[PDB]
Amino acid sequence: LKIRDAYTIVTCPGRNFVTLKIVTESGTHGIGDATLNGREMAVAAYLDEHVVPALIGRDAGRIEDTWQYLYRGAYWRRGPVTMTAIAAVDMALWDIKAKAAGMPLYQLLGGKSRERVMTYAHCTGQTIEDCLGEVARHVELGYRAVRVQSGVPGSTEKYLNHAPKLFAAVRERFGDDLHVLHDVHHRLTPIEAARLGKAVEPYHLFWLEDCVPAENQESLRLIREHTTTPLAIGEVFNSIHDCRELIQNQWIDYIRMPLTHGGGITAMRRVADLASLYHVRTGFHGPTDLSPVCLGAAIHFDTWVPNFGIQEHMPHTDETDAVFPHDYRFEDGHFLAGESPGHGVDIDEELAAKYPYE
Amino acid sequence: LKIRDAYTIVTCPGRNFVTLKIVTESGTHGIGDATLNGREMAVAAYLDEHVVPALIGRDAGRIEDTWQYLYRGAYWRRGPVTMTAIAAVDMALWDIKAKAAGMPLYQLLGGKSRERVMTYAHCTGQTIEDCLGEVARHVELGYRAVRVQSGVPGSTEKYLNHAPKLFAAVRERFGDDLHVLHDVHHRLTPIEAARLGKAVEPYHLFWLEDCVPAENQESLRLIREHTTTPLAIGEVFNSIHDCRELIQNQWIDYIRMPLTHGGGITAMRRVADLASLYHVRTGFHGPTDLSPVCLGAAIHFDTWVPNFGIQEHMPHTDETDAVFPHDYRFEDGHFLAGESPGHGVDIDEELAAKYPYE
């Protein structure tokens, strides 16, 4: 089944989303998320002006080959723009393949490893008290895990002294069963993150993510050597080469690279495999700037992957969900993979047209 | 589609072969090679007496889960018997899945990466001259690569001195285009293999395999540090853990672990992924004691895998091919993957019955 047509679709049902659609001569089509928040048009042009023309005429069943083919075109380079475009193509081809196989994507990957995928919600507030309120309502919704953030009265020093109080407060009010995560937004140096890790050890965090800027993977060594608080990193990584050392040296517990920014299903399957050799688990970055297409594919991946950790959940706007109909569902804090052939997500082009890029 | 029945089949159309067959309630079935040369009955009993009973009632689409499930039963242990049984189950389930998907196995894995898979033939003789004869006829058959072995007039010392003469002779008579491989059958110590590697450098071997006993992976260090002759190892490995260090330290160029002895498609997919991170390529062990079932699955794997190296070919007897009908074909020195749903191989139970275990 050759590729007869392929094109990008830019819509803004709440926020900008770029989608790639590929249609085979047999009529079957597939879509993949190509949204790169804050630089959306760079990817759109990349696909339109360079990738799409090359897709025409190619055999859509050659997923691996197309991935390698496009990777070569980028001159073997890893980059946010480069890998998002490739991931979009990869997601579309896997969509087409699963449909062609008449099975939901997770079946194509190796089958179900779990019935549902645990998620975590964002609980932020200006004060520790506000935050505790959010945690309260989210645990009501059934979430078994929450990411907690709050404002710091008054600076690195103030943050380091305040952070522990927040976690102490959450534990006093909610107990030890709840999984609590925290993002440090890479504001720290390795030794400062080490200090933070040690200070929050009594609160047993699920993870402490994005502790320090990690372009230099060795940055995590000092943290790992000084604390037993679990570490997560990589929401912004684009290649397995951005985390190969982190994983092989066992400096992290969760890899956060998401499908769209990490080259797609093909590439992340390999990162997950490498991670499993070292006890590292998946912890897919799941912000709103990652369309329901990515989310659906992510849920399928999460359903199959043996070393599954947790899935981030930042609910999309109703308009976004309308434009991107899907069969994955959220229930009692967990996601359930769809059972429809393909990744179970589609795009309503007409409705999408009613929401122009902004 | 639940597993309604599963059983082993032992036949001897030339040599002993153990096959596992799994049948789903929907009628669809799949088979996997479980032949462990010289200890065939150990695996047969393993499957019959312990694995089969546990397969009944399980969902055959859960390949990953079944793999992990059986791995746990073995108490997380890697072993020739243990992994062959698991590989048989894994091959059968992948067979069922591809059929269910209505596509040949290579399509299910990610599509075609190459049109045909290069092979190499065994060219042995009592004398260098006999060997050259075999090479002559095999290159006539279209083979682009050959493994050369010959008797040693007269001992490690005699072998070390004779080996270079054999390669010099093959190069003088056939030129530099031909790929020539050599198996040292682990008769050497690391420093002796290093010496051999250096001595044959002028003959540019495709590879020198099984240089030394490698249970201790560090055994390859000395060889790699003293020669630029390509190294291949692992025809007898059962786990990714038997070669993780060899690969990450770049001490080898080709991994030889085959599907049946290496836990199947599921497991070897991961080993191939790890290998690609370090320029290591696949070089599947393909003796006759590995049934056409394994060969068919191997050809599909070889067709997709990006870091494909070469496929070993030791033709089966006509009786073996009769008992195991298949759609893969050999042409001009290369294999062509079948296009039939599943891995394209089946077993004629009636005919198989006419050849009892020996």
Asked if A62 and B111 come within 8 Å (Cβ–Cβ), the reply is yes
Provide the Cα torsion A206, A212, A215, A221; round to 10°.
-70
Count the Cβ atoms, other than its own, within 10 Å of residue B295: 29
- Cα–Cα distances (Å) from A335 to A37, B297, B308, in that order, read 24, 34, 37
Is A122 flagged in the annotation as binding? Answer: yes
The reply to whether residue B112 touches residue A277, judged by beta carbons under 8 angstroms, is no
Is B313 assigned to a binding site? no
PDB experimental method: X-ray
Report the CATH number of the A1-104+340-358 domain. 3.30.390.10
Q: Angle CA(B70)–CA(B73)–CA(B79) in degrees, nearest 5?
A: 80
What gap in Å lies between CA B92 and CA B88, rounded to an integer?
A: 6
Please tell me which residue in A29, A162, A182, A185 is annotated as part of the active site. Answer: A185
Q: Residue B199 burial (CB < 10 Å; 0-12/13-18/19+)?
A: middle
- CB-nearest partner of B103 from A59, A66, A101: A101
DSSP summary character for residue B220: G
DSSP string, B133-159: HHHHHHHHTT-SEEEEEE-----HHHH
Which residue in B50, B182, B185, B204 is the catalytic one? B185
Contact A288, A261 (CB under 8 A): no
* Contacts of A73 by beta carbon, 8 Å cutoff, 6+ apart: A50, A51, A54
Angle between helices A63-73 and A264-276 (to 10 degrees): 100
Chain B: nearest CA to A278, how far in angstroms? Answer: 11
| Alpha helix stretches (DSSP H) within chain B | 40-46, 52-55, 63-73, 80-101, 105-109, 128-140, 156-174, 190-199, 221-226, 244-248, 264-276, 292-304, 318-323, 349-353
CB A283 within 8 A of CB A256: yes
On chain A, the residues whose CB falls within 8 A of the CB of B63 are 110-111
SS3 B242: helix
Nearest partner of B328 among B352, B289, B293, judged by Cα = B293
Interface of A with B (CB under 8 A): 59, 61-66, 68, 97, 100-103, 107-113, 240, 244, 248, 266, 269-270, 273-274, 276-277, 304, 306
Which of B2, B3, B63 has the most A C-beta neighbours within 10 Å, making it the best mutation to test the interface with A?
B63
How far is it, in rounded angstroms, from Cα B318 to Cα B324?
10
What is the three-class DSSP state of B244? helix
DSSP letters for B252-283: -SEE---TTTTTHHHHHHHHHHHHHTTT-EE-
3-state secondary structure chain A: CEEEEEEEEEECCCCCEEEEEEEECCCCEEEEECCCCCCHHHHHHHHHHHHHHHHCCCECCCHHHHHHHHHHHCCCCCCHHHHHHHHHHHHHHHHHHHHHHCCEHHHHHCCCCCCCEEEEEEEEECCHHHHHHHHHHHHHCCCCEEEEEECCCCCHHHHHHHHHHHHHHHHHHHCCCCEEEEECCCCCCHHHHHHHHHHCHHHCCCEEECCCCCCCHHHHHHHHHHCCCCEEECCCCCCHHHCHHHHHCCCCCEECCCCCCCCHHHHHHHHHHHHHCCCCEECCCCCCCCCHHHHHHHHHHHHHCCCECCEECCCCCHHHHHHCCECCEEECCEEECCCCCECCECCCHHHHHCCCCC
d(CA A324, CA A191) in angstroms, rounded, equals: 44
CA atoms of A336 and A343, how far apart (whole Å): 12
Q: Please report, as a single letter, which amino acid is at residue B91.
A: M
Record the tokens describing residue A108, joined without a space: 């194509």
How many angstroms is the resolution? 2.2
**Residue B323: φ, ψ to 5°:** -65, -30
Cβ B109 vs Cβ B269: under 8 Å: yes
User: Between 3.40.50.300, 3.20.20.120, 3.30.1360.30, 3.90.650.10, what CATH number should domain B105-339 receive?
Assistant: 3.20.20.120
Q: Quickly tell me which residue has 């795009």 as its tokens.
A: A347
Q: Please, which residues bridge with residue A104 across strands?
A: A342
Do B96 and B30 touch, CB atoms closer than 8 A? yes
**DSSP H/E element including B21:** strand B17-24
Per the CB < 8 A criterion, the answer to whether B320 and B292 are in contact is yes
What letter would DSSP give residue B345? B
CB A312 within 8 A of CB A145: no
Nearest chain A CA: its distance from B298 CA (Å):
17
- The verdict on a CB contact (< 8 Å) between A101 and B108 is yes
Task: Measure Cα distances from B204 to A318, B171, B177, B197, B200 in Å.
Answer: 64, 9, 10, 10, 7
Please tell me the distance from the alpha carbon of residue A200 to that of residue A229, in angstroms, as a whole number.
7
Instruction: Report the distance separating Cα A171 and Cα A132, nearest Å.
Output: 10
Which chain A residues are within 8 Å of B100, Cβ to Cβ? 101-103
CA dihedral sign of residues B230, B233, B239, B245: negative
User: Which residues face B32 on adjacent strands?
Assistant: B20
A280, B281 in Cβ contact below 8 A?
Answer: no
Using an 8 Å Cβ cutoff, are B315 and B120 in contact? no
**Residue B155 · residue B96 · CB < 8 Å:** no
**Sheet arrangement for strand B3-11:** B3-11, B17-24, B29-33
User: Are the CB atoms for B230 and B208 separated by under 8 Å?
Assistant: yes
d(CA B56, CA B50): 11
The answer to the question of whether A346 is labelled as a binding residue is no
Cβ neighbours, 10 Å, residue A339: 12
Q: Do B265 and B90 meet the contact criterion of CB atoms below 8 Å apart?
A: yes
Contacts of A272 in chain B (CB under 8 A): none
Q: Show the tokens assigned to B132.
A: 């050259």
Query: Which residues, 6 or more positions from A157, have their beta carbon under 8 angstroms from its beta carbon?
Result: none
Q: Which residues contact A332 (CB under 8 A, 6 or more apart)?
A: A142
| Dist. CA B233–CA B256, nearest whole Å | 6
Q: Where are the domains of chain A?
A: 1-104+340-358, 105-339
Angle made by CA atoms B358, B86, B292, in degrees to the nearest 5: 50
CB pairs under 8 A between A and B: 85
The residue assigned the tokens 């048989």 is: B88
Judge whether B261 counts as a catalytic residue.
Answer: no
Which secondary structure element, helix H or strand E, spans residue B125, and what is its range?
A: strand B117-125
Report yes or no: A95 and A32 within 8 Å, Cβ to Cβ: yes
> CA B148 to CA B127: how far, in whole Å?
11
Please answer whether residues A255 and A282 qualify as being in contact, where contact means their C-beta atoms are separated by less than 8 angstroms. yes
Cβ contact (<8 Å) for A244 and B277? yes
Q: Please measure the distance between the N-terminal and C-terminal CA atoms of chain A and give it in whole angstroms.
A: 36
Q: Which of B209, B327, B343 is CA-nearest to residue B264?
A: B343
A209 and A233 Cβ atoms separated by less than 8 Å: yes
Label residue B310 left, alpha or beta by phi (over 0 means left) and psi (-120 to 50 means alpha).
Answer: beta
Q: Which of A63, A101, A248 is facing B111, going by the closest CB pair?
A: A63
Q: Distance from B108 to chain A by nearest Cα, in Å?
A: 7
Residue B63 has its nearest CB partner, among A68, A110, A244, at A110
Burial of A126 from C-beta contacts in 10 A (0-12 / 13-18 / 19+): exposed
Show the tokens assigned to A196: 């933070």
Q: Is A348 annotated as a binding residue?
A: no
